[PDB]
């Protein structure tokens, strides 16, 4: 009975409910973020449960501010609540200190908000992990991640999701340090296709995004033409 | 798992377990016999038995997914004379949370209901009635839901 | 604030807290009530003098308004709470309506309070049953009984508490127009009925009588013994 | 704001075939003291709306912050819906009415103008919540000194063009500079059309004939 | 056994069971459907009566002049959610003098349904909606499940036996964008008929239709008003 | 959280409050208390349990408490809950005094406290107070008085009572040897010394393992006193002498 | 353990189901809707002779044009009746009109189910009401009969039977009633079914009956009027 | 929100068990002593740190409340810190209202009453500490004890903590009402020594006194001098 | 000895033996990170050293850390759960800022540790929440007290130390350091930085590289807490 609330430690010093919540995040599909010289690139595999859904149903990239992006994996209700909380943090920061929130500070505030949900019995830990990434002339390109336990750590490349280990073994090869978002995009599609399992899941449509010097520091959905060419290159690479 | 308790009896099973542990990977290495095992609970097996030298490869078996459900149903209903109208995708979708050992119930009970109704060949409704049989659900004497 | 749901439904539809409240009610000294042509009378059973209690501080028939009185059977603290609440509401009624309170009004109020505590959060139901008697302004005799569930009815003669089934059977077999013709016949009827559970009588009973304008009547031990004798 | 402190003077606007034009001098006065002399009083709310403000400048800057945050938030969702000029006019009317009802006015009479879906828009709001839509507007002493010329020319000619509106705005501002005590020579003029909002530099009332 | 007593107690597989039981409550209700074309969106419903003397329960409600829903599950929850939707739409009109875009309403719905499933002692909304609306971006159909998870569908069918309906819908999805209003309504009726149990036919007594479009407020057809739509099947 | 809730305020399957029953079970182990109402006084006789050679003497008493100028009470159960209840009683007395400028009658007070206690055992989720009270006082309505309270919230006027250890035995003699209305203060004190000597079976009255209180009316005003050592020991010597002559 | 707001593995709130069980303990009540009016009949169920039968107020009027009949607990109704009446009067106050029947049923239905344990009110309701009501009255739309259940689910019925013998009573009501009854015939059939269910032999003293018609306000049948109907009954 | 139900509840034998366990924790701590001399009051405990790496001066166990009254404990540490803070606050509130130094009996009553609240309040557990307070009020020494149950006792001399029974036997042997301050502190130092498990270095014990001059801790050099004998 | 009575192993309440099992387990969680830290007090310098584990080459090594500044003068090591560590560091920064706002001078190390330990004591009294699974160590210069080294734990213990270790290897490091402090003075110069590095290397048996530890220092000459860079760290690493 040591795993019924987050207000109890296991006899070996663990909070189990958090471990279970983090287990949930490994049932959702795979997401990827790669940091480069110019900026950040998010790419998510969106599984099509049924043929009857629209294109763009349950988009899994959000915009928490005009310069920040947000990729999610797990329970979508938790993902959307945390998107709301990150938006609120950004707006409050702008109204109070008079300028765009530095991304690290946003990651810290959001993570504290998540961690506060992993102490008490009256609430339960969020079932979602997510990655924030922005770009500014001063602070440069950044890419962070926050897990259900509330730990925030910067990353040069990461994959949150079901096939997280396969992507991680894949993302390690780019040498992202010395490229720009334009080639990172093709790489991201390439990986998201390499990791996808056609035996288990039926089919997917990519969601790609970026923020970098090519946007003047604006996070925005990658344009249609570039997305299609990336998808085509990824398809060819999967001979 | 072993534990410190004053109640006897379990010690003997633990002791034959120690002997099995030693047989798998111990003095006098054995490299001609291989072992298999199956368990519903892996959260209670001893670490010295899940150790990475005795039981090296551990394999997970998930509750089958939609494609798996259609595959299982198809495999088991292969012998019965079924009509060319049954949409196994439908039957997969209306069978959430069905462990693989359940179409056997569905496939067979559909055949049984076809027999009951004095039929010769199966039809979608036969499989649906089979599914309602396998779920084993009771009513609350009323249907206030809209 | 403590906000748990003490009373809750159960399979087969039972308010087990309510049932246990009335099971407590079944552990209280028998109280009786009858209704006659022009007199009501309340009868209780005293557990024992004990030769050291002060019976003045132990009263079991109380007045809620000059024209309304009540007797209970169950726990005592809950009885005290309900009696004070009813008293406050009778006085508020007097102040707002400028007319004397009526027996049905106060019985309704008490029953509503019991139901409220039976359906609120973090509250244990009252384990008390009441017997309200009195005369409305029109001068009509009245008798109501309130259960711990919040239900009330009107009666000609009901007994509440320990041994209630026996006394109710006695009253049901015996209640007839003959026994209410003479106020003494009614007082003696109540005394006799009670005398099917209590042992000693006289020093093991209390009585109460009320008339149209006549205030609450407490019968003294000597007069009660004389009434039993005349019954003898 | 029970007591205005640093204030912006008259703001005037007029619509034509394809949009609107608004004008406003860059002067915040602290009671007959041209204290701040290079402050713009015209803002772009979104790609199809602009705003001019008279009265307290702190209040205008706060409303600027609130309204721009709202626009940021909406563009954030990226659902394909943007506030129209009418939406911003309604939002302002309700905001100022609420502040009026709470006995704490927002000391700002404020001219909203936009062009969306092939139709122009030109609205007005006051600290008390009075709102309306007209083909030409003017606040402060501009409602007395400039509104007559705009109204005369529009009633005579119902539909103006871009240069006609430009010239009429410049004449109006010249009259204001001649006869308005709290006015200043340098001003900006904004124009919305099918292409977006555009604020021009500190144009001069350079033509000031002073034959005494 | 002990992982399905509260909504805040994660199960060791990364599943909350209470949410799934609420989904079940939504699946036990009577069938309903939704469609969208390039011009209209049509809901089609199947009411059912407890006895032969009682009426068939209403299961389409109004929200605004440009939005409509169709419920399936506990009514009281559906009524609560209708109250919420209508208040939100009215507030949008009062503040902005403008119809509320549909997507935003569905987002607020999801967020409101999210709070219960993360606090101790609260329970999920045991109702499943099918919102049909018409905004500046055109027709829309959405679905809502007790888990605060909404879906932008082009056609769906929630409720009991709804899977055969979903099969027919996915079967003819190509035509829906080009269809007339009549053909769309007939597709919806035909699917909801696929749901009916064999010896039971569509009648004026067990059908209701809702429609919203470019120049047509949301309107509900029921009783004999549905006969013109049914006559032709 | 329902997992850890104790349900200290819910009925059992026979309509008996268990937490209350256990609360009354705690009292039956603390010091004995005695009540005796004379015709010219009231008196409380509890046993001094804090019997160690290394305790210090402080305060005018150790179990008797003043509540007004004209009222005092003694406690059996937990010491800390005792302190809490005593404080609330003092507050009640002063609040009545402030509203009416008259000393609070005795049943006024006892029922105010018991109402607090009852409410506490009705709703809230707390444990009930494990204390039973004995009071003494005078008021122009009923003269010298002796009340008693319990964890339930029930009270009772007693011409003689006993709440605490060996309550059955003490009340048994009190029934055997009480003259209703035929008792002077001196006789009541002697009866107390006798009954307690029985009950405190451990040794005999050491004149130091006991507490006595007297409430009287003197010069028109109440006077409360706690018997010193000399008078108590003299009373005990008189008691032993009387018993010896009796044998 | 097992909070009040909890979902069974079937998708049913447990507390709601148990509340629906309590309606079988209650006496049997009937209601019939006809063009000429609507009637209510119920069984007083006199346990012992010693109690005044008149003191069982088990039918009350909500307004001059509404009537209510209940089954379940005595105590649980009282608050629902007060809510219904204050809502009717509130509507009359605001709109100077007469509150309709469906609307009062809806308001009473909403007031049900708003029960919980966490963050509600200093004294909000805890368990669901365990009573099943019958609203019948004449509105601008004519005679109406509505049936309510502890689930906050209400539906307008042509004839309904609620209570310990509701089954069997319903089969009878279904065999007899037709679309063209008369009010008096409805009273006769209702009294006959009641007689058929009660353990005791029917008499004017151990029932109550009430009808509401377009002309006359809600009417309570008097002892002599009851005898007059029962004699030929 | 926070639990609104008591976590200490009566048992079938009418015993509040959690209080008993708190008392067990107190009995399993470090020893402590207090004596009431004729002209002073002495407290003394043992502060045996776990290694050479602990700064003896980093924290203290004998702590004052005002200039004339102070206290020591035996039990858990953090609970002692909380109670020290609450005592100082209550003392300052009394001074603010009455402009006079708080008497020891009243401060003990008030701190104890604060200790009762946590035996009955909701969602909290009893303090695992017992305190002794010393004061010099009314030209007269005072020694009090306060336990997790919220009960207090006036003591002539006491010893609580590990092996407190034997300590109380010792002190019963060595009390003499006409005792003098230096002899009293010497006797205390001994009692701690009755069971210590090592050599009593100056940096392994604490003492504090009270007299007319005022409650005040003893500096280690003073401690070594007294320990000389 | 090990009895259980009810929920004594599920919420922070006493066991029949006067034991708080939840606090004990929380202490057990400090080791779940797998890291260790050491702090050493010198004559004019106080040092805190800690491990730095780059699990792989996708993390940004600049971000993963366990050194933080509370003020410009007071700097701390965090060990154990990372999220809890961040929470406690935020609370510490807020507390120090409030101290300077309210009382007009910078916060003493000991008093900050006391405030934070009090917070943790509230966490270990009330049962709604659970004790945090992280431990602090603080360092800075006092005006008239010299260099200060202090630590705090989940239960609320805030002892001040002459040389300390926290983490998985608490006991071995503490033994080594106790012996050193026994030897002459426990290091008596700014080359106390070498003693801490040696202790960590011996206990963990690592033979550190420049990019596998992070140091912080405070000097009497330079009171402002400083986070030793990689070049300086490599210089010290070569020194031994």
Swiss-Prot record, chain A:
Superkingdom of origin: Eukaryota
Induction: Down-regulated by antioxidants BO-653 and probucol. Up-regulated by bacterial lipopolysaccharides (LPS) and TNF.
UniProt xrefs under PROSITE patterns: PROTEASOME_ALPHA_1, PROTEASOME_ALPHA_2
Ranges that cross the membrane: none
Keyword GTP-binding recorded: no
List of residues that carry Phosphoserine: 237
One Gene Ontology CC term in the entry: extracellular exosome
UniProt KW Manganese keyword: no
Record CDD domains: proteasome_alpha_type_3
GO annotation terms (biological process): proteasome-mediated ubiquitin-dependent protein catabolic process
SUBUNIT field: The 26S proteasome consists of a 20S proteasome core and two 19S regulatory subunits. The 20S proteasome core is a barrel-shaped complex made of 28 subunits that are arranged in four stacked rings. The two outer rings are each formed by seven alpha subunits, and the two inner rings are formed by seven beta subunits. The proteolytic activity is exerted by three beta-subunits PSMB5, PSMB6 and PSMB7. Interacts with AURKB. Interacts with CDKN1A. Interacts with MDM2 and RB1. Interacts with the C-terminus of TBXA2R isoform 2. Interacts with DNAJB2.
Similarity section: Belongs to the peptidase T1A family.
Protein's UniProt name: Proteasome subunit alpha type-3
Species of origin: Homo sapiens (Human)
Lineage of the species this protein comes from: Eukaryota, Metazoa, Chordata, Craniata, Vertebrata
UniProtKB/Swiss-Prot annotation, chain D:
GO cellular component: ciliary basal body; cytoplasm; cytosol; extracellular exosome; mitochondrion; nucleoplasm; nucleus; proteasome complex
Phosphotyrosine: residues carrying this PTM: 57
Inducing stimuli: Up-regulated in fibrolamellar carcinomas.
Keyword set, alphabetical order: Acetylation, Cytoplasm, Disease variant, Host-virus interaction, Nucleus, Phosphoprotein, Proteasome
Localization: Cytoplasm; Nucleus
The keyword Cytoplasm belongs to this UniProt entry's keyword annotation: yes
Origin: domain of life: Eukaryota
GO BP terms in the entry: negative regulation of inflammatory response to antigenic stimulus; proteasome-mediated ubiquitin-dependent protein catabolic process
Keyword rRNA-binding tagged: no
Record-level Gene Ontology MF annotations: lipopolysaccharide binding
Disease per UniProt entry: Proteasome-associated autoinflammatory syndrome 3: An autoinflammatory disorder characterized by onset in early infancy and recurrent fever, nodular dermatitis, myositis, panniculitis-induced lipodystrophy, lymphadenopathy, and immune dysregulation. Variable accompanying features may include joint contractures, hepatosplenomegaly, anemia, thrombocytopenia, recurrent infections, autoantibodies, and hypergammaglobulinemia. Some patients may have intracranial calcifications. PRAAS3 inheritance is autosomal recessive or digenic.
Protein family membership: Belongs to the peptidase T1B family.
Protein name: Proteasome subunit beta type-4
UniProt organism field: Homo sapiens (Human)
Entire protein: shown range: 46 to 257 of 264
Curated annotation (Swiss-Prot), chain F:
GO cellular component: cytoplasm; cytosol; extracellular exosome; intracellular membrane-bounded organelle; nucleoplasm; nucleus; P-body; proteasome complex
Places the protein is found: Cytoplasm; Nucleus
Gene3D superfamilies: Glutamine Phosphoribosylpyrophosphate, subunit 1, domain 1
InterPro entries: Ntn_hydrolases_N, Proteasome_alpha, Proteasome_alpha-type, Proteasome_asu_N, Proteasome_bsu_CS, Proteasome_sua/b
Modification Phosphoserine, positions: 12, 74, 172
Record-listed N6-acetyllysine modification sites: 126, 175
GO BP of this protein: proteasome-mediated ubiquitin-dependent protein catabolic process
Keywords: Acetylation, Cytoplasm, Host-virus interaction, Nucleus, Phosphoprotein, Proteasome
Pfam families: Proteasome, Proteasome_A_N
Swiss-Prot/TrEMBL induction comment: Down-regulated by antioxidants BO-653 and probucol.
Keyword Nucleus: yes
Family annotation (SUPFAM superfamilies): N-terminal nucleophile aminohydrolases (Ntn hydrolases) (SSF56235)
Function according to Swiss-Prot or TrEMBL: Component of the 20S core proteasome complex involved in the proteolytic degradation of most intracellular proteins. This complex plays numerous essential roles within the cell by associating with different regulatory particles. Associated with two 19S regulatory particles, forms the 26S proteasome and thus participates in the ATP-dependent degradation of ubiquitinated proteins.
Cited PANTHER family: PROTEASOME SUBUNIT ALPHA/BETA
Family affiliation: Belongs to the peptidase T1A family.
The protein's name in its UniProt record: Proteasome subunit alpha type-4
The gene coding this protein: PSMA4
UniProtKB/Swiss-Prot annotation, chain I:
Domain of life: Eukaryota
Pfam families: Proteasome, Proteasome_A_N
Compartment(s): Cytoplasm; Nucleus
Keyword Transport in annotation: no
Matching Gene3D superfamilies: Glutamine Phosphoribosylpyrophosphate, subunit 1, domain 1 (3.60.20.10)
This protein's GO CC annotations: cilium; cytoplasm; cytosol; extracellular exosome; mitochondrion; myofibril; nuclear matrix; nucleoplasm
InterPro entries (UniProt xref): Ntn_hydrolases_N, Proteasome_alpha, Proteasome_alpha-type, Proteasome_asu_N, Proteasome_sua/b, Proteasome_subunit_alpha6
Entry keyword annotation includes Glycoprotein: yes
Residues that bear Phosphoserine: 15, 61-62
Annotated glycosylation sites: 3
Gene Ontology MF annotations: endopeptidase activity; NF-kappaB binding; purine ribonucleoside triphosphate binding; RNA binding
Keywords: Acetylation, Cytoplasm, Glycoprotein, Nucleus, Phosphoprotein, Proteasome
In-chain residues carrying the UniProt-annotated modification Phosphotyrosine: 157
Gene Ontology process terms (BP): positive regulation of canonical NF-kappaB signal transduction; proteasome-mediated ubiquitin-dependent protein catabolic process; proteolysis involved in protein catabolic process; regulation of inflammatory response
Subunit structure: The 26S proteasome consists of a 20S proteasome core and two 19S regulatory subunits. The 20S proteasome core is a barrel-shaped complex made of 28 subunits that are arranged in four stacked rings. The two outer rings are each formed by seven alpha subunits, and the two inner rings are formed by seven beta subunits. The proteolytic activity is exerted by three beta-subunits PSMB5, PSMB6 and PSMB7. Interacts with ALKBH4.
Listed NCBIfam families: PRK03996.1
Annotated protein name in UniProt: Proteasome subunit alpha type-6
């Amino acid at each position: 009975g040591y795993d019924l609330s987050a207000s109890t430690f296991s006899p070996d010093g663990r909070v189990f409910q958090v471990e279970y919540a983090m287990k949930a995040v490994e049932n959702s599909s795979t997401a990827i973020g790669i940091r480069c010289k110019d900026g950040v690139v998010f790419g998510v595999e969106k599984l099509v449960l049924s043929k009857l859904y629209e294109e763009g149903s349950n988009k899994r990239l959000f915009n928490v501010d005009r310069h920040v992006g947000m990729a999610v994996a797990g329970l979508l209700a938790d993902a959307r609540s945390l998107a709301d909380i990150a938006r609120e943090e950004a707006s409050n920061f702008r109204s109070n200190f008079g300028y765009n929130i530095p991304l690290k500070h946003l990651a810290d505030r959001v993570a504290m908000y998540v961690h506060a949900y992993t102490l008490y019995s009256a609430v339960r830990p969020f079932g979602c992990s997510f990655m924030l990434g922005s770009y500014s002339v001063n602070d440069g390109a950044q890419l962070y991640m926050i897990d259900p336990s509330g730990v925030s750590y910067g990353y040069w490349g990461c994959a949150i999701g079901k096939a997280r280990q396969a992507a991680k073994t894949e993302i390690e090869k780019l040498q992202m340090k010395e490229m720009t978002c334009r080639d990172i995009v093709k790489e991201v599609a390439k990986i998201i296709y390499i990791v996808h399992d056609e035996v288990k899941d039926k089919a997917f449509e990519l969601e790609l995004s970026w923020v970098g010097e090519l946007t003047n520091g604006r996070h925005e959905i990658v344009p249609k033409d570039i997305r299609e060419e990336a998808e085509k290159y990824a398809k060819e690479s999967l001979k | 798992k072993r534990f410190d308790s004053e109640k006897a009896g379990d010690r003997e099973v633990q002791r034959t377990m120690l002997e099995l542990l030693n047989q798998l990977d111990g003095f006098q290495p054995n490299t001609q016999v291989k072992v298999i095992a199956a368990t519903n609970r892996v959260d209670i097996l001893d670490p010295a038995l899940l150790r990475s030298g005795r039981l090296d490869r551990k394999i997970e078996f998930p509750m089958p997914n939609e494609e798996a459900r259609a595959r299982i149903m198809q495999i088991h209903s292969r012998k019965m004379n079924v009509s060319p109208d049954v949409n196994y995708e439908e039957l997969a979708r209306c069978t959430d949370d069905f462990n693989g050992a359940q179409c056997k119930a569905v496939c067979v009970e559909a055949g049984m209901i076809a027999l009951r109704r004095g039929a010769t060949e199966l039809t979608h409704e036969d499989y649906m009635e089979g599914i309602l049989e396998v779920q084993a659900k009771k009513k609350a004497n009323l249907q206030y839901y809209a | 604030s403590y906000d748990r749901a003490i009373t809750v439904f159960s399979p087969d539809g039972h308010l087990f807290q309510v049932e246990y409240a009335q099971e407590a009610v079944k552990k209280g000294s028998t109280a009786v009530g009858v209704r006659g042509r022009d007199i009501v009378v309340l009868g209780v059973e005293k557990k024992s003098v004990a030769k050291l209690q002060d019976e003045r501080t132990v009263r079991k028939i109380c007045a809620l308004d000059d024209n309304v009185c009540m007797a209970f059977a169950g726990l005592t603290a809950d009885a005290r709470i309900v009696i004070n609440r009813a008293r406050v509401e009778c006085q508020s009624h007097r102040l707002t309506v400028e007319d004397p309170v009526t027996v049905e009004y106060i019985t309704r109020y008490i029953a509503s309070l019991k139901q409220r505590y039976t359906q609120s959060n973090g509250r244990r139901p009252f384990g008390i049953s009441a017997l309200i008697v009195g005369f409305d302004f029109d001068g009509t005799p009245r008798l109501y009984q309130t259960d711990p569930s919040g239900t009330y009815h009107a009666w000609k003669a009901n007994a509440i508490g320990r041994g209630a089934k026996s006394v109710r059977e006695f009253l049901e077999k015996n209640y007839t127009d003959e026994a209410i013709e003479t106020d003494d016949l009614t007082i003696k009827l109540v005394i006799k009925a009670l005398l099917e559970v209590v042992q000693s009588g006289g020093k093991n009973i209390e009585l109460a009588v009320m008339r149209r304008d006549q205030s609450l009547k407490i019968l003294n031990p000597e007069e009660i013994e004389k009434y039993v004798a005349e019954i003898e | 704001t029970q007591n205005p402190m640093v204030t912006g003077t008259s703001v005037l606007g007029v619509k034509f075939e394809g949009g609107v034009v608004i004008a406003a001098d860059m002067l915040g006065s602290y009671g007959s003291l041209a204290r701040f002399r290079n402050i713009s009083r015209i803002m772009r709310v979104n790609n199809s709306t602009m705003l001019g403000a008279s009265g307290d400048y702190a209040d205008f800057q706060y409303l600027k912050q609130v309204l721009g945050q709202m626009v940021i938030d909406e563009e954030l969702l990226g659902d394909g819906h943007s506030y129209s000029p009418r939406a911003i006019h309604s939002w302002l009317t309700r905001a100022m009415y609420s502040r009026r009802s709470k006995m704490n006015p927002l000391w700002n009479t404020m001219v909203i103008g936009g062009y969306a879906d092939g139709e122009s828009f030109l609205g007005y709001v006051d600290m008390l919540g009075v709102a309306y839509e007209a083909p030409s507007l003017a606040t402060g002493y501009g409602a007395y000194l400039a509104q007559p010329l705009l109204r005369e020319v529009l009633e005579k000619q119902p539909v103006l063009s871009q240069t006609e509106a430009r010239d009429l705005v410049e004449r109006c501002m010249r009259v204001l500079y001649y006869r308005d005590a709290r006015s200043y020579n340098r001003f900006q003029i904004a124009t919305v059309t099918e292409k977006g909002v555009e604020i021009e530099g500190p144009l001069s009332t350079e033509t000031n004939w002073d034959i005494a | 056994n002990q992982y399905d007593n509260d909504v805040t107690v994660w199960s060791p597989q990364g599943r909350i069971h209470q949410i799934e039981y609420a989904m079940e409550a939504v699946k036990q209700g009577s069938a309903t459907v939704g469609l969208k074309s390039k011009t209209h969106a049509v809901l089609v419903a199947l009411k059912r009566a407890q006895s032969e003397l009682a009426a068939h329960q209403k299961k389409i409600l109004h929200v605004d002049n440009h939005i409509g829903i169709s419920i399936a599950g506990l009514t009281a929850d559906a009524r609560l959610l209708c109250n919420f939707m209508r208040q939100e739409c009215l507030d949008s009109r009062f503040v902005f003098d403008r119809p509320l875009p549909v997507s935003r309403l569905v987002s607020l719905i999801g967020s409101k349904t999210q709070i219960p499933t993360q606090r101790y002692g609260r329970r999920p909304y045991g109702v499943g909606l099918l919102i049909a609306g018409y905004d500046d971006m055109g027709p829309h159909i959405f679905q809502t499940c007790p888990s605060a998870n909404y879906f932008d569908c082009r056609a769906m069918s929630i409720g009991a036996r709804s899977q055969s309906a979903r099969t027919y819908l996915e079967r003819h999805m190509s035509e829906f964008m080009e269809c007339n209003l009549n053909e769309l309504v007939k597709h919806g009726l035909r699917a909801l008929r696929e749901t009916l149990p064999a010896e039971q036919d569509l009648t004026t007594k067990n059908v209701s239709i809702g429609i919203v479009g470019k120049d047509l407020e949301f309107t509900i057809y029921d009783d004999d008003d549905v006969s013109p739509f049914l006559e032709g099947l | 959280s329902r997992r850890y809730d104790s349900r200290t305020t819910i009925f059992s399957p026979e309509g008996r409050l268990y937490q209350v029953e256990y609360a009354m079970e705690a009292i039956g182990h603390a010091g004995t208390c005695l009540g005796i109402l004379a015709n010219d006084g009231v008196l409380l006789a509890a046993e001094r349990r804090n019997i160690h050679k290394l305790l210090d003497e402080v305060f005018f008493s150790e179990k008797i408490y003043k509540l007004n100028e004209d009222m005092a009470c003694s406690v059996a159960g937990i010491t800390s809950d005792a302190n809490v209840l005593t404080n609330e009683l003092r507050l009640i007395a002063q609040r009545y005094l402030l509203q009416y400028q008259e000393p609070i009658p005795c049943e006024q007070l006892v029922t105010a406290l018991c109402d607090i206690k009852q409410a506490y055992t009705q709703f809230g989720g707390k444990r009930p107070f494990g204390v039973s009270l004995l009071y003494i006082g005078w008021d122009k309505h009923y003269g010298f008085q002796l009340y008693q309270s319990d964890p339930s919230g029930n009270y009772g006027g007693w011409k003689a009572t006993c709440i605490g250890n060996n309550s059955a035995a003490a009340v048994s003699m009190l029934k055997q040897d009480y003259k209703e209305g035929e008792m002077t203060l001196k006789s009541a004190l002697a009866l107390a010394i006798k009954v307690l000597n029985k009950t405190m079976d451990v040794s005999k009255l050491s004149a130091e393992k006991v507490e006595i209180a007297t409430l009287t009316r003197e010069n028109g005003k109440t006077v409360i006193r706690v018997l010193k050592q000399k008078e108590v020991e003299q009373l005990i010597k008189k008691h032993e002498e009387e018993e010896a002559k009796a044998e | 353990y097992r909070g009040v707001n909890t979902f069974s593995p079937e998708g049913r709130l447990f507390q709601v189901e148990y509340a629906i069980e309590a309606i079988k303990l209650g006496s049997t009540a009937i209601g019939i809707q006809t063009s000429e009016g609507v009637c209510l009949a119920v069984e007083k169920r006199i346990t012992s002779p010693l109690m005044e039968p008149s003191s069982i107020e088990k039918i009350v009027e909500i307004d001059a044009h509404i009537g209510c009949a209940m089954s379940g607990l005595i105590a649980d109704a009282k608050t629902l009746i007060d809510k219904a009446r204050v809502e009717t009067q509130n509507h009359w106050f605001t709109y100077n009109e007469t509150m309709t029947v469906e609307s009062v049923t809806q308001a009473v239905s909403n007031l049900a189910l708003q029960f919980g344990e966490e963050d509600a009110d200093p004294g909000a309701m805890s368990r669901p009401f365990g009573v099943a009501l019958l609203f019948g009255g004449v509105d601008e739309k004519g005679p109406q009969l509505f049936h309510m259940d502890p689930s906050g689910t209400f539906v307008q019925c042509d004839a309904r039977a609620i209570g310990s013998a509701s089954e069997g009573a319903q089969s009878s009501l279904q065999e007899v009633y037709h679309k063209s009854m008369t009010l008096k015939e409805a009273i006769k059939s209702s009294l006959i079914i009641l007689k058929q269910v009660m353990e005791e032999k029917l008499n004017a003293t151990n029932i109550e009956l009430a009808t509401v018609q377009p002309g006359q306000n809600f009417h309570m049948f008097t002892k002599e009027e009851l005898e007059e109907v029962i004699k030929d009954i | 929100r926070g639990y609104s139900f008591s976590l200490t509840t009566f048992s079938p034998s009418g015993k509040l068990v959690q209080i008993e366990y708190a008392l067990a924790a107190v009995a399993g701590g470090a020893p402590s002593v207090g004596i009431k001399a004729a002209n002073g009051v002495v407290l003394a405990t043992e502060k045996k740190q776990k290694s050479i790496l602990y700064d003896e001066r980093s924290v203290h166990k004998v702590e004052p409340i005002t200039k004339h009254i102070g206290l020591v404990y035996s039990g858990m540490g953090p609970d002692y810190r909380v109670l020290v803070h609450r005592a100082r606050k209550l003392a300052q509130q009394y001074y603010l209202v009455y402009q006079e130094p708080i008497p020891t009996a009243q401060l003990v009553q008030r701190v104890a009453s604060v200790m009762q609240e946590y035996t009955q309040s909701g969602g909290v557990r009893p303090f695992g500490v017992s305190l002794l307070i010393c004061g010099w009020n009314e030209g007269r020494p005072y020694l009090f004890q306060s336990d997790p149950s919220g009960a207090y006792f006036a003591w002539k001399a006491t010893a609580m903590g590990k092996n407190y029974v034997n300590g109380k036997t010792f002190l019963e042997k060595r009390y003499n009402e006409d005792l003098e301050l230096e002899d009293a502190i010497h006797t205390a130092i001994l009692t701690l020594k009755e069971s210590f498990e090592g050599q009593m270095t100056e940096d392994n014990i604490e003492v504090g006194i009270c007299n007319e001059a005022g409650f005040r801790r003893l500096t280690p050099t003073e401690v070594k001098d007294y320990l000389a004998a | 000895r090990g009895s259980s009575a009810g929920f004594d192993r599920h919420i922070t309440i006493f066991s029949p033996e006067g034991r708080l099992y939840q606090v004990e387990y929380a202490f057990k969680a400090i080791n779940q990170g797998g890291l260790t830290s050491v702090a050493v007090r010198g004559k004019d310098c106080a040092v805190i050293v800690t491990q730095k584990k780059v699990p792989d080459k996708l993390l940004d090594s600049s971000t993963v850390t366990h050194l933080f500044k509370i003020t410009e003068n007071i700097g701390c090591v965090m060990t154990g759960m990372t999220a809890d560590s961040r929470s406690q560091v935020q609370r510490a920064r807020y507390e120090a800022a409030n101290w300077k706002y309210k009382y007009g001078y910078e916060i003493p190390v000991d008093m900050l540790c006391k405030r934070i330990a009090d917070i943790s004591q509230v966490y270990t009294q009330n049962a709604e929440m659970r004790p945090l699974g992280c431990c602090m160590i603080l360092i800075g210069i006092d005006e008239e007290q010299g260099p200060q080294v202090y630590k705090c734990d989940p239960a609320g213990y805030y002892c001040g130390f002459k040389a300390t270790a926290a983490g998985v290897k608490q006991t071995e490091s503490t033994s080594f350091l106790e012996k050193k402090v026994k030897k002459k003075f426990d290091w008596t110069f700014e080359q106390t930085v070498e003693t801490a590095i040696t202790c960590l290397s011996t206990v963990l048996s690592i033979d550190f590289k420049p990019s596998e530890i992070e140091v912080g220092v405070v000097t009497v000459e330079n009171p402002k807490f400083r986070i030793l860079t990689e070049a300086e760290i490599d210089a010290h690493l070569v020194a031994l």
